[PDB]
Amino acid sequence: QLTSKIISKFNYNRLAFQLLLNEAPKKYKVYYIPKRGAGFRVIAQPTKELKNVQRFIVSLLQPKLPVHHKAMAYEYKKSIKDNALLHKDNNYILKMDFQNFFNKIKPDIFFSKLENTGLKLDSFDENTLRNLLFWRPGKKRSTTLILSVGAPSSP
DNA sequence: GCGAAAGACACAGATTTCTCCTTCGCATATAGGGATGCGAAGGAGAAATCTGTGTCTTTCGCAACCCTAAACC
Incomplete structure (x- = not known):
């Protein structure tokens, strides 16, 4: 049960x-936002009411989702x-980069990974997660959802 | 992920112009008659150019954000 915990914590009717x-x-x-040089960048950030519940949500799923140790971003005691x-003691180096990384994550691929980990969740919690x-x-009527960036739960 | 407002891509078909194709009318170098060769207009039927419509590509100053310093995404 997950919807009960969020309702109880924030005393919502x-x-x-x-x-x-x-x-x-x-x-x-x-x-x-201005760019270093010439141009501009696009950001989208939620309201105050949705942010402090998103942060609460990520606290429940932090000790349940494994993360590989070769990722050095948004991790405790890593920088x-x-x-x-x-790479401080090697000669040749090659670097690559993705294309529009943050808007290629959708609930269709998000729930597939959840099913593979062996955790079974109710349909109501699935609805709550998808819409938050x-x-x-x-x-x-677009019916298209993207993870986005600037939200506390995306990273 | 994508507002409005203009282009690119692919497929038809239409049309004026040009070019190929009869029909006969001179002609002229051989004393009139006959023959080989070429010029003149109608009447085709072919071909380059233009114009039409329908399907996607790009990417906004997009109700709804915080006010302490540095770096990264």
Whole structure:
């Protein structure tokens, strides 16, 4: 059970929680930031009410989802210095990069990994998870959700 | 992931112009008559150019953000 814990912690009633559930994807603000040089960048950040519940959510799933030890980003007691200590004594180096990394994660691929780990979750928790950690750009009938960046749970 | 407003890509078909194709009318170098050769217009039927419509590509200043310093995504 997961929806019960979130309801109890924030002392939400039935009607209020349901109202927030189906309007959560649109509570985002889109803005531009200057670039070092010439140009601009696009950011989208949620409201205060949705942020402090997203942070609470990630606390429950932190001790249940394994993460490989070769990833040195958004990890406790890890930084750039530990990243550069691996290649500090080698001659030839090759570097690569992805393409639009953060908007290629969708609930279709997210739930597939959850099923493979052996954890079984109820359908209500699936609905709660799908409508809370994801963003819906465009019109209300787009029916497309992207993880986005700038949210406390994406990294 | 993608607003509005203009281009690119692929497939038809239409049309004016040019070029190939009869039909006969001179012609002229051999004393009139006959023959080989070429010029003149209608009437085709072919071909380059243009124009039409329908399917996607790019990417916004997009109700709804914080105000302490440095680096990365």
